[PDB]
Amino acid sequence: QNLKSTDRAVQQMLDKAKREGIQTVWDRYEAMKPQCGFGETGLCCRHCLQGPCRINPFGDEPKVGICGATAEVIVARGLDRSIAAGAAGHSGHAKHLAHTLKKAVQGKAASYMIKDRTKLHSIAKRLGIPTEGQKDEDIALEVAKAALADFHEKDTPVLWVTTVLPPSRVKVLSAHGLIPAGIDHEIAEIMHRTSMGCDADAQNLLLGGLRCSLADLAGCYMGTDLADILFGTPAPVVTESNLGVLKADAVNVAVHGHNPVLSDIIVSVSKEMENEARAAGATGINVVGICDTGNEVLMRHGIPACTHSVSQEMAMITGALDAMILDYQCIQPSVATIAECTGTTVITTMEMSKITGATHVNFAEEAAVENAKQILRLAIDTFKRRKGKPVEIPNIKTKVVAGFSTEAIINALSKLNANDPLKPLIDNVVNGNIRGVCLFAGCNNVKVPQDQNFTTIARKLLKQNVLVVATGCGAGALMRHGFMDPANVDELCGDGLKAVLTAIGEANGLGGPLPPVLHMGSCVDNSRAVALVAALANRLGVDLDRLPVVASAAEAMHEKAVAIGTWAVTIGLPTHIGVLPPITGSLPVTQILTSSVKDITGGYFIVELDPETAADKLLAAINERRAGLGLPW
Amino acid sequence: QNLKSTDRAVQQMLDKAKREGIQTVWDRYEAMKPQCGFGETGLCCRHCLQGPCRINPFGDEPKVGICGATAEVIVARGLDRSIAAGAAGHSGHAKHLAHTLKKAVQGKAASYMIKDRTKLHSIAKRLGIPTEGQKDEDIALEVAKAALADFHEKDTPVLWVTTVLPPSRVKVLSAHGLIPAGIDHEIAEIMHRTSMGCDADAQNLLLGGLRCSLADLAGCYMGTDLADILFGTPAPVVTESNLGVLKADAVNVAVHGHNPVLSDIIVSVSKEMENEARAAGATGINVVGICDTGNEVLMRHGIPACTHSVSQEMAMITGALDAMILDYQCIQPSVATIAECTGTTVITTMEMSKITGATHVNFAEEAAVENAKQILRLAIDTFKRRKGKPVEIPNIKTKVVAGFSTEAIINALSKLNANDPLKPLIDNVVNGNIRGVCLFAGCNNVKVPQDQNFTTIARKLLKQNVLVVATGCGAGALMRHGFMDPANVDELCGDGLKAVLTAIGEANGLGGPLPPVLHMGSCVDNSRAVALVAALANRLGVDLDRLPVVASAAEAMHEKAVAIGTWAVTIGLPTHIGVLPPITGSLPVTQILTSSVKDITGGYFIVELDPETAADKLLAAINERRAGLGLPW
Ligand code: SF4
Ligand code: SF4
Ligand code: SF4
Ligand code: SF4
Ligand code: FES
Numbered sequence A, B: 001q002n003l004k005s006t007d008r009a010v011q012q013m014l015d016k017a018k019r020e021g022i023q024t025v026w027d028r029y030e031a032m033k034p035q036c037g038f039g040e041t042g043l044c045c046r047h048c049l050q051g052p053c054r055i056n057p058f059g060d061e062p063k064v065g066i067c068g069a070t071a072e073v074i075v076a077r078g079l080d081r082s083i084a085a086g087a088a089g090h091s092g093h094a095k096h097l098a099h100t101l102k103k104a105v106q107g108k109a110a111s112y113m114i115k116d117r118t119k120l121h122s123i124a125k126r127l128g129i130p131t132e133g134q135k136d137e138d139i140a141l142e143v144a145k146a147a148l149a150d151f152h153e154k155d156t157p158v159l160w161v162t163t164v165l166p167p168s169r170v171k172v173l174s175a176h177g178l179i180p181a182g183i184d185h186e187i188a189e190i191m192h193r194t195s196m197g198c199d200a201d202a203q204n205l206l207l208g209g210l211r212c213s214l215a216d217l218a219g220c221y222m223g224t225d226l227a228d229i230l231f232g233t234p235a236p237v238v239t240e241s242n243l244g245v246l247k248a249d250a251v252n253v254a255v256h257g258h259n260p261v262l263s264d265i266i267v268s269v270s271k272e273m274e275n276e277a278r279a280a281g282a283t284g285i286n287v288v289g290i291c292d293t294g295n296e297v298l299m300r301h302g303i304p305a306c307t308h309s310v311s312q313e314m315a316m317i318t319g320a321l322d323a324m325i326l327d328y329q330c331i332q333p334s335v336a337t338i339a340e341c342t343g344t345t346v347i348t349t350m351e352m353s354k355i356t357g358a359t360h361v362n363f364a365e366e367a368a369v370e371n372a373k374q375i376l377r378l379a380i381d382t383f384k385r386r387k388g389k390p391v392e393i394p395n396i397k398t399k400v401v402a403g404f405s406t407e408a409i410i411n412a413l414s415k416l417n418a419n420d421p422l423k424p425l426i427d428n429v430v431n432g433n434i435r436g437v438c439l440f441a442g443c444n445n446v447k448v449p450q451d452q453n454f455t456t457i458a459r460k461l462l463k464q465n466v467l468v469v470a471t472g473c474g475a476g477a478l479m480r481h482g483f484m485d486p487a488n489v490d491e492l493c494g495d496g497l498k499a500v501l502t503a504i505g506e507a508n509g510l511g512g513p514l515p516p517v518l519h520m521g522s523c524v525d526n527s528r529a530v531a532l533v534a535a536l537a538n539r540l541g542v543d544l545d546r547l548p549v550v551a552s553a554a555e556a557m558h559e560k561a562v563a564i565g566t567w568a569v570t571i572g573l574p575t576h577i578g579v580l581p582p583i584t585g586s587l588p589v590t591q592i593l594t595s596s597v598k599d600i601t602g603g604y605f606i607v608e609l610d611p612e613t614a615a616d617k618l619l620a621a622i623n624e625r626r627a628g629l630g631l632p633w
């Protein structure tokens, strides 16, 4: 089982699933091997009904698509569509929060409100919305309207790109025609240009892809901004992770998916219904997180994280998961089938994200609290049905310190320098105590033993004094293996990094260091890392492609992860991906994405499936940036 | 060669290509066989990097996607993305015309103007834009702004859906949640809901697809509306089609793609540069059409149609094609390679549609006439380079009567009844002289001997007194085989249909009948057929699903054709498709699309690859509608 997952709680549940004859994601993977090499290399096209077309990576015919589409066109078009689909997911998330804020401040959804006025005003100021002498609800209405306006063409470009990056970077991107005109506009234009008989030049196609990836960045940043207004900007928090946070005697309710509009209300209402759960025989309601909705409520409320990503079915296999409340994205639809075996009540809530065999509850912002109670009562009913059923919850959990929004990091740093809080970080980059910064992002992937790349790479970087930040299931992987427990600083961190984490931690009244890895939140909260990196660039007077900052999507899976990787490259970062994207069938496209794009944006992809090799390559990328600044390394 | 194309001019050029060693679309098809059956059935998914996933149509594992996606989810998600891509192509076309009109009336593009004020005012009235006492340029500005507004969410739904269908049909669609909220909004929501871990219920997925297909309908109707304002509403016209319209002694310039913003200016400017072409040794400039841009200038200017779709390379093989001026969509990228062999100058003009090895000319509305001259001079230069080269132009062409916009058809009918012009058509439906109406639409497809399904099906329907209208490459197929020549009415038409075409033709001062098939224009001009059918419904007091009207995408290829077929079903029409769409891997999805959707929208797909069988099925569908109205059949 350790070839499937390095998580020991997951290994225990894989044995239980095998005993009980419950098919898992890993079983369905094994049943799929060997996978189609045309698809794995990207040399397959189904963009019209003359297909499917494929191209042999090597050898004889077929060499070209039926319409004349070359390998480099086919690969570029497929990649572009994956970027657009990722952008659409982050677009939809942000759009649904923008409508939630608009409803809140127009008096249409009283369960929602402006919880962070400070953030609201700073966003309004960044966008040029006047605040002085205005009511909050009117400022927020203007912010929500500006968010919705970024989805379409208007007299300005996408402001959640142009107002969040340094002017020098916007200038570079503008010179190459890469600034998005509208978020959904770019998604549609990708789908158009990649349809049959349209764009057929790899470089032109890929520039469109870079531009659409910035539409994805805008959706991420908009999503974080609006979620923080509505639900609070995260601050440091301490909780736990892994399956051991389930409690046999409680109603265990997992929030799963991505959008907190739903999950954040569940958290509040669950506290109300504690007595009603005790009436049913439970100790209370135990809300736990799966995937990124779980990260959202972990970051804001300290809700413990149950599991992530590839191992999500394992929470159910314990027998103790009474409900799984879903919104959208990264939900294995197998959960609806597995629930028949495990007793779990799987509940969908979004009109455009239903699963055959799952109970659907039509959530509406206008009735959020009512819907939450309907949902939690189904969960209580399910708990009662397992009175006296044995469960097997692995007694495995880790301590997780998290909540490191960029505002939190700046505040923590300000304890070392009150009016120049970035300077202490830059000082230690310059003197070598911090070699650089690495953002771990993205998913787990059944092709990679779960968490293996994240932890292998992270260990090597931390020993080399790299400051490591993480989001999404990269944060999930690191938290479930102790990387967010400050007790592990001595073991994991080089001396210089330990010194820095210790100084900051002690200066914030903690008696101990910051954790080895800083949890910056969900996948949309990769935007928080952008905010931090752009602020560092501005403080140093350079563009992002001169900073010793890298990213690693070490076990990427979702189209969203491809979009995030592509905009990391586009804003100037060396960007590792630890799974093969479907590009290796075209050497010209691979060359553009791993080399020549350097001369456009300064970033570049690092495709490397061996994690020890990937870490050496990330260190070389960091150290090249150090040398470019004239620093020792 | 007659197994590849039933067009004798195409057969002649296939022999020339074979002699000269020039690879064609049919050669690349043969090199691709046998094609992947997982893709052909729709049982392949590449929506995340855990894939590719495939499902055996029958037999043993794999039975399910790695994430748990069933066959019916995989098939529905792939179909939805094809609909969204089609919508994006028609979206982009309409959007680029909306920007062209806005620029024209804001004084920014003087080569463009309001050519049809009548149409402008009728559109403004349909949309509720006030006209009385307003300047045309201000009315048009409001129309252009309303067009752009339909791409995003606002306080109204998509008006180019809700104002173009009868209220009863809008009510049916609204009750099922199928009215689009915004064109690019729906495209993005499709890409979101079909991404990994989101929508996983076939019925829910397919309802999203129906809704996105209405976004496509809106793009089509908007495109026709704006093109008519800018370039004139078509009226009856007589010209010719097939390769014989090329002239060895002229500068032969093909306009190819879809958007007339470009091609319509080429047509005007080409007339200016006649003397400049004679200076170079030519008789003049001979503009000819390929694909739908060719239909646009055929319908409005009588520009002869050279070829269509699958056979586009053959125009080049003659050796006489001096230039091919491209915008976007349905352009085989092979043309850029073939030009090295044939001497043709292939010119791209749109930023998002480039082809490696083709000359790019950055067309801008603001400089349209300048760009046109730059482009036509490259063509003249190319003509000079083939002084004394032998060419082989097949001496094959047909006479084409076309220009049957819905306004034209109504006007023609008004010669038989001035204040009730639809009544004479309905009278002859009722008395049986017209059995019903069939719209042929869509592409050719290399899998089907070119034109074979269109002509086989059309012959059977015409003998059964069906009124046949056609658009796109369905019109192209029928025109190249004589179906738009009134000389062929006696041979092709049943007695009742002949009587009706003759009465209308003679009453319009023609001495002869209308042609056997009425050419209603380009693929976006399928919207014209909707206008006609909706007017018939309104005049009869019934919804479209009670009318004896059917559609046939008899040789479908492009994602746009899938979108058109799906919205034909959604507005209530029995809709034949003569190529296999990638649905047969899921019986539940096939059952929904060919049967149970009847109970939602009243329309349904008819999947039938045998054209004689398809014609019998279309006749049965028509006759069922007749019986439902209590008519004999
Ligand atoms: S777009 Fe070209 S390569 Fe793709 S399926 Fe169609 S013919 Fe084949
Ligand atoms: S990291 Fe990937 S699997 Fe995890 S929640 Fe984000 S997109 Fe989904
Ligand atoms: S979305 Fe599911 S079925 Fe599709 S490639 Fe990913 S794991 Fe396979
Ligand atoms: S009918 Fe098809 S091939 Fe022809 S121009 Fe329209 S979408 Fe293209
Ligand atoms: S041939 Fe396998 S992914 Fe298309």
Ligand code: FES
Binding pocket: A036, A039, A044, A046, A052, B036, B037, B038, B039, B040, B044, B045, B052, B054
């Ligand atoms: S396995 Fe051939 S289309 Fe994917």
